[PDB]
Write a protein that binds this DNA or RNA. Structure first.
Ligand SMILES: [K+]
Ligand SMILES: [K+]
Ligand SMILES: [K+]
Ligand SMILES: [K+]
Ligand SMILES: [K+]
Ligand SMILES: [K+]
Ligand SMILES: [K+]
Ligand SMILES: [K+]
Ligand SMILES: [K+]
Ligand SMILES: [Mg+2]
Ligand SMILES: [Mg+2]
Ligand SMILES: [Mg+2]
Ligand SMILES: [Mg+2]
Ligand SMILES: [Mg+2]
Ligand SMILES: [Mg+2]
Ligand SMILES: [Mg+2]
Ligand SMILES: [Mg+2]
Ligand SMILES: [Mg+2]
Ligand SMILES: [Mg+2]
Ligand SMILES: [Mg+2]
Ligand SMILES: [Mg+2]
Ligand SMILES: [Mg+2]
Ligand SMILES: [Mg+2]
Ligand SMILES: [Mg+2]
Ligand SMILES: [Mg+2]
Ligand SMILES: [Mg+2]
Ligand SMILES: [Mg+2]
Ligand SMILES: [Mg+2]
Ligand SMILES: [Mg+2]
Ligand SMILES: [Mg+2]
Ligand SMILES: [Mg+2]
Ligand SMILES: [Mg+2]
Ligand SMILES: [Mg+2]
Ligand SMILES: [Mg+2]
Ligand SMILES: [Mg+2]
Ligand SMILES: [Mg+2]
Ligand SMILES: [Mg+2]
Ligand SMILES: [Mg+2]
Ligand SMILES: [Mg+2]
Ligand SMILES: [Mg+2]
Ligand SMILES: [Mg+2]
Ligand SMILES: [Mg+2]
Ligand SMILES: [Mg+2]
Ligand SMILES: [Mg+2]
Ligand SMILES: [Mg+2]
Ligand SMILES: [Mg+2]
Ligand SMILES: [Mg+2]
Ligand SMILES: [Mg+2]
Ligand SMILES: [Mg+2]
Ligand SMILES: [Mg+2]
Ligand SMILES: [Mg+2]
Ligand SMILES: [Mg+2]
Ligand SMILES: [Mg+2]
Ligand SMILES: [Mg+2]
Ligand SMILES: [Mg+2]
Ligand SMILES: [Mg+2]
Ligand SMILES: [Mg+2]
Ligand SMILES: [Mg+2]
Ligand SMILES: [Mg+2]
Ligand SMILES: [Mg+2]
Ligand SMILES: [Mg+2]
Ligand SMILES: [Mg+2]
Lengths: 145, 152, 110, 118, 50, 100, 221
RNA sequence: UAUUCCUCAAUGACCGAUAGCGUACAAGUACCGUGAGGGAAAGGUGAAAAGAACCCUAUGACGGGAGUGCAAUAGAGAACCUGAGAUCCGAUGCGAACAAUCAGUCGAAGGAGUAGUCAAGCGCACUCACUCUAACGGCGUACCUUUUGCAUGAUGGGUCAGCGAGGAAAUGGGAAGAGCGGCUUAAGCCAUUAGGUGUAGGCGCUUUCCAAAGGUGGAAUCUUCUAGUUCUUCCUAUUUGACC
RNA sequence: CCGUUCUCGUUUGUACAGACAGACUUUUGGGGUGCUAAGAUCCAAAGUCGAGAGGGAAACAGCCCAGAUCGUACGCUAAGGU
RNA sequence: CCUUGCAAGCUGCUUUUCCAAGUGUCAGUAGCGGAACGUUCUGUCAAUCGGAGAAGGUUUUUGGUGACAAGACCUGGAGAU
């Protein structure tokens, strides 16, 4: 348990629990962005986006996640640069799907030497849905009549 | 499967090893020249085993020797140790004459006697009784050991 | 490989290379070799594109790519080239802030 | 599950009680199917008998998609693994992933144009 | 290396001695110089306790 | 350059232990040198082995000195410590651009 | 229950075709209680079927295919591939290269291994509860309704193998020659494949005694 | 005891129309040769012919309707069950007369056609929605064989469909598995809805050097250790045409 | 005689092989023959191709760097370059 | 795949599995070794499927490292394992 918690923290996520049907987490678009690193890949996301990361081994469907490695925060007014990360910034996500991709064909052949091989490969991926970006001063809910 | 012997689940101790069918595709590992290499006489399959290349062979450079005796006699060897073991086993009567028929019936002599029985001196330290033998040949040690115990 | 599986991969081939098995088997294998090689060449092509966009964004304010990326290395800013190029394309003021920070870190010679 | 809505709705398990290719899926039903049903309340599990045919798992999704996995001559662990793969998927078509980051607003401060002043 | 640039039909082009090649060669020399310095400094005696 | 990360930050003195790192490739070399590296325990490029400072190892390193980087205990500790200290965390910067 | 393979004697009730109680018989332990191994059964069955196979298959070689031995054209000059006949192995209407010729498919086995396989089969049929022992196989008539009524009376059965100690009684021969699910055999014809074909084995006292005596008589060599 | 120009009955882990006899069909025919001689091709409507009366357009129905029939592209005159591919002629969408190359692969503006989900107010944005095409950019000198080495201006192939080359017996050298403890039968004999018997023989025990006569103490000291043979599968060798 | 390698890569019984047509490069600064000619030819010591893809040498078997289990629109370097 | 632990059975108390760690290994011609897919026929089979539509053919979707396998529509009209 604590092993999975610490290794998922080294990768860059934290499991916060399943999603209840009463919760309404999918608010509309707000103009802030955050840059999160999950493993080796870095994504520049806003709320409402989706990403396809590598297979995360310690999360299930409809799990709320908190992405603990935020490298940059930005809005229309100011930018917060993490050197290397921001300990105060927080990005909320929801796990959506673990799925295999389309099969690619690995074909090797050496001409006039009587040698060829074929083999397929399917790589698994995890889809995340970004819900919230915290740490930078958001604009107010602006009903500008 | 409670002691079930059906014709639907019979199998052997190990899986059956199948034939190596040469001359099929690339992936079998034994296609396009099978296992024969490129050209020559051993790929056309016209080579006789034991040929040496035109050099005079070892089977013709070495001398012949001797002759064959068509009247050679073959005697089956029995040691004293086996006879003593069968005495202690209670299968050979120690007080009667030990002929060749006794040895053939007990099994100290193999399936085919040819010309008789030769008595050997192996296991001569197990003889403790005066035994009487009737064999075809006997060695010096065996006769000395028997007559030292008092037999003939 | 099957005959029908080759006829599925030769779909869209010009000429008799989509009907005849002798002609379609040669052209499909070349396509598979090209796909295997381009799975490695795509990474170099994309990284070169990122360097071109980062350099084009940075030279607008008078800082070269070679000075800019080493300034961000010196300030322990670990944004990679893909994210930096996306920032240069879509967030010009945050990229200008990063260029100013890198210029204060490593101005270089000249 | 797309935005909290579970996409897999029906899991059909088609087997045969006589043929030898259904031994794995048969033993899967006594062992792993009740645990899967208990941990999946929103999912409907249907059981079908088809004598003299090969067994399969059919998943029916919300976007009117059916995905069939034949599970002949398999082990219960492989059958359970493919049932989990059916549950975890959104039911989208199996084609190449064009992009790994899907967004509708690519910029907050506005995309760089030629008429941008600083 | 190949030093045949004036004969045959097989063209082995002569490699120039440019400043980039000199800059690489100096770095190789610096690495081997540091290796020689480490070995010279540590070759006064043998470390004890086998 | 690549030797920049290996240039020494500590004066070179006598040491009890040596760290040998392989920085050159295998093909195109003598099989005598390849077997010497194999007896040192180096099989792949950018691999590091630890040995004690005796003449039996010094002769091997002197044979293959153009393919490896040899470091003492203090130099290895300084390199690793400086790398970790450079990757240590710092307080963030906040920049307000505004007025487009 | 029991464990099978300890070479213990078994006791069995005896009946007849009229479902009467006629006593008990002790079966020999070294015939009806041997360990059950499947590989020996597999080998004996393979030996039986290979001995049964007839093997009259035949194709023609180039010495038998009707056709002349003349060269079809010149060696050189025509512009076609060189051929020696028009009955080659790749020709249409040619010979069959490496095709079959009539031969026997029989293999060998040891007598004691065949005996061990017979013991294993009888042991399994005794341990399953599918062995029924009769006092006699005598019948009132040769009509087949007697056997049909008895088979309908029997429980949990598809096919029955009946073994008689000596030659078959003529009434028993005539009553069962139209039923494909009841088959008869003498004791001298008892074998592993026909034991395994039918899931129920019905023997008489003389069949049991002759089988046990044959197993207890060692092979004369 | 040997053989089958012949007759009767039975069987097949024998073939199934490029197979099986050269011949499933009027074949030693047609055809080729002066002659001896060589020597093919070609199976199938439908359960039953009920095989399409009649009308229209053509010189003429094999066409378009009508009717029989479960079904009519199931409509034939030594051929109509199913009806693949090379090949030929059309229709719809996109590309295509200022741009070159084993004709693809990795990205990709645009054009064209079509779906579904449901919370909120019956819109609209969600499914990277899905399918076809691809202006433009980067990269890319076929395959086999033989060779030190082939884009090679070295060999071979017009394309498609079907066919086409490591296989059988007996005896040897071994490996894996099993039976028995000495092991195992060959010809034969008695029965076959099927097995059982048969000791002649072979190997081992066994004795080691030797041309032949001749000659022959294994180990261990501490309740003693002291031999193999026969099948099955697979890889190789010899004799046979011996991968073609 | 002693260290390092922890790998048997060593010796040997049994069974199955293939191959016995090699090429180029290291100052003509290891040499013989030739004209101190050859992409000639014959030996000694290394490396590569043979049987080896990837980056540089415009193009390139044999030169320089370096050894391809698979996936990624992640990072650091070699030969060589800006 | 190997190596080392850990846990089970074994008989072998030492050879097989499960799990974890491995800055351990995985280019390949001649050649050698291991493991599998498919075709025709046979036993299981007087058993199972079939006008609730067999074999065969054209599309399309799904699975496996691969030879390949399987779901559905259209055609087809009686066999398949
Ligand atoms: K000149
Ligand atoms: K002739
Ligand atoms: K014919
Ligand atoms: K033929
Ligand atoms: K029809
Ligand atoms: K292109
Ligand atoms: K020519
Ligand atoms: K043999
Ligand atoms: K044995
Ligand atoms: Mg090979
Ligand atoms: Mg070939
Ligand atoms: Mg060979
Ligand atoms: Mg050869
Ligand atoms: Mg050849
Ligand atoms: Mg040759
Ligand atoms: Mg030239
Ligand atoms: Mg050149
Ligand atoms: Mg200069
Ligand atoms: Mg450099
Ligand atoms: Mg002839
Ligand atoms: Mg002639
Ligand atoms: Mg010939
Ligand atoms: Mg024929
Ligand atoms: Mg014919
Ligand atoms: Mg036909
Ligand atoms: Mg025909
Ligand atoms: Mg005439
Ligand atoms: Mg008419
Ligand atoms: Mg019909
Ligand atoms: Mg067509
Ligand atoms: Mg058109
Ligand atoms: Mg144009
Ligand atoms: Mg042109
Ligand atoms: Mg594409
Ligand atoms: Mg498009
Ligand atoms: Mg559109
Ligand atoms: Mg080009
Ligand atoms: Mg030549
Ligand atoms: Mg060669
Ligand atoms: Mg070339
Ligand atoms: Mg050519
Ligand atoms: Mg040409
Ligand atoms: Mg030629
Ligand atoms: Mg030609
Ligand atoms: Mg063909
Ligand atoms: Mg020679
Ligand atoms: Mg030579
Ligand atoms: Mg030479
Ligand atoms: Mg030289
Ligand atoms: Mg020289
Ligand atoms: Mg020269
Ligand atoms: Mg030369
Ligand atoms: Mg050499
Ligand atoms: Mg090599
Ligand atoms: Mg190369
Ligand atoms: Mg290259
Ligand atoms: Mg190039
Ligand atoms: Mg490798
Ligand atoms: Mg760099
Ligand atoms: Mg390999
Ligand atoms: Mg069908
Ligand atoms: Mg079958």
């Amino acid at each position: 348990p604590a092993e999975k918690v610490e290794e998922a923290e080294e990768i860059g996520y934290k499991v916060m629990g399943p999603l209840k049907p009463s919760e309404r987490l999918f608010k509309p678009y707000e103009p802030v962005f955050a840059i999160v690193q999950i493993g080796s890949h870095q994504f520049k996301v806003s709320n409402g986006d989706s990403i396809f990361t590598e297979k995360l081994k310690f999360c299930d469907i409809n799990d709320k996640l908190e992405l603990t490695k935020v490298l940059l925060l930005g809005s229309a007014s100011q930018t917060i640069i993490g050197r290397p990360i921001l300990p105060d910034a927080t990005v909320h996500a929801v796990v959506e799907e673990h799925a295999l991709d389309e099969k690619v064909l690995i074909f090797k052949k050496k001409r006039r030497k009587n040698y060829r091989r074929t083999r397929g490969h399917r790589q698994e991926l995890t889809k995340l849905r970004i819900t919230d970006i915290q740490g930078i001063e958001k604009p107010e809910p602006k009903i500008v009549h | 499967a409670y002691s079930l012997l059906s014709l639907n689940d019979l199998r052997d101790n190990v899986p059956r090893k199948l034939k190596t069918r040469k001359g099929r595709g690339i992936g079998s590992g034994k296609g396009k020249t099978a296992g024969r290499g490129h050209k020559g006489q051993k790929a056309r399959g016209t080579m006789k085993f034991g040929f040496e290349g035109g050099q005079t062979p070892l089977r013709r450079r070495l001398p012949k020797r001797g002759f064959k005796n068509k009247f050679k006699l073959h005697f089956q060897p029995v040691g004293l140790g086996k006879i003593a073991k069968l005495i202690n086993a209670g299968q050979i009567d120690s007080h009667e004459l030990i002929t060749m028929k006794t040895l053939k019936d007990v099994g100290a002599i193999g399936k085919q006697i040819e010309d008789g029985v030769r008595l050997m001196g192996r296991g001569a330290d197990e003889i403790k009784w005066p035994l009487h033998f009737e064999v075809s040949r006997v060695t010096v040690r065996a006769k000395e050991v028997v007559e030292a115990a008092g037999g003939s | 490989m099957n005959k029908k599986e080759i006829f599925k991969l030769a779909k869209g081939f010009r000429g008799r290379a989509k009907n005849c098995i002798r002609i379609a088997r040669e052209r499909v294998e070349k396509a598979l070799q090209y796909s295997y090689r381009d799975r490695r060449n795509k990474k170099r092509e994309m990284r070169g594109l990122w360097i071109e966009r980062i350099n084009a964004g940075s030279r607008q304010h008078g800082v070269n790519y070679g000075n800019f990326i080493h300034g961000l290395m010196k300030e322990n800013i670990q944004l990679n080239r893909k994210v930096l190029s996306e920032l240069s394309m879509h967030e010009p003021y945050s990229f200008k802030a990063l260029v100013d920070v890198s210029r204060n870190s490593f101005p270089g010679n000249k | 599950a797309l935005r909290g809505v579970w996409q897999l709705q029906k899991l059909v398990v088609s087997y045969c009680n006589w043929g030898g290719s259904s031994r794995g899926i048969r033993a899967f039903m006594e062992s792993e199917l009740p645990a899967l049903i208990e941990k999946n309340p929103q999912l409907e599990v249907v059981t079908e008998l088809s004598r003299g045919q090969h067994p399969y798992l059919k998943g029916i999704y919300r976007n009117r998609n059916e995905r069939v996995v034949c599970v002949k001559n398999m082990d219960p662990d492989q059958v359970l693994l493919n049932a989990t793969r059916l549950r975890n998927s959104l039911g989208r078509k199996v084609v190449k992933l064009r992009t790994r980051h899907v967004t509708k607003h690519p910029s907050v401060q506005g995309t760089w144009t030629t008429a941008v002043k600083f | 290396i190949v030093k045949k640039h004036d004969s045959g039909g097989l063209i082995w082009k002569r490699i120039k001695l440019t400043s980039t090649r000199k800059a690489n060669a100096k770095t190789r020399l610096r690495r081997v110089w540091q290796n020689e310095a480490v070995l010279k400094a540590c070759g006064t005696s043998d470390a004890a306790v086998s | 350059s690549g030797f920049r990360a290996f240039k020494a930050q500590v004066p070179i003195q006598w040491s009890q232990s040596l760290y040998i790192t392989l920085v050159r490739g295998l093909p195109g070399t003598r099989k005598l040198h390849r077997r010497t590296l194999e007896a040192m325990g180096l099989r792949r490029c950018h691999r590091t082995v630890l040995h004690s400072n005796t003449s039996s190892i010094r002769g091997m390193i002197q044979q293959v000195k153009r393919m490896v980087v040899v470091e003492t205990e203090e130099m290895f500790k300084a390199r690793k410590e400086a790398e970790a200290n450079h990757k240590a965390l710092r307080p963030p910067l906040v920049v307000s651009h505004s007025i487009p | 229950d029991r464990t099978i393979g300890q070479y213990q004697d078994l006791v069995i009730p005896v009946t007849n075709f009229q479902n009467e109680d006629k006593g008990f018989m002790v079966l020999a332990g070294d015939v009806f209680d041997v360990p059950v191994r499947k590989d020996i059964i597999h080998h004996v069955v393979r030996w039986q079927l290979a001995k049964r196979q007839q093997g009259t298959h035949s194709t023609k070689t180039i010495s038998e295919v009707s056709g002349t031995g003349r060269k079809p054209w010149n060696q050189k000059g025509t512009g076609r591939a060189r051929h020696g006949t028009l009955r080659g192995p790749q020709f249409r209407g040619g010979c069959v290269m490496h095709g079959p010729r009539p031969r026997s498919h029989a293999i060998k086995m040891n007598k004691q291994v065949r005996r061990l396989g017979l013991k294993i089969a009888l042991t399994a049929r005794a341990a399953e509860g599918k062995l029924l022992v009769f006092d006699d196989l005598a019948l009132p008539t040769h009509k087949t309704k007697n056997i049909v009524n008895y088979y309908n009376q029997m429980e949990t059965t598809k096919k029955v193998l009946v073994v008689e100690g000596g030659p078959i009684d003529e009434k028993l021969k005539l009553a069962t020659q139209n039923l494909h699910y009841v088959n008869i055999l003498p004791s001298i014809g008892l074998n592993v494949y026909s034991i395994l074909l039918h899931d129920t084995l019905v023997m008489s006292r003389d069949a049991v005694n002759k089988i046990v005596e044959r197993m207890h008589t060692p092979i004369n060599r």
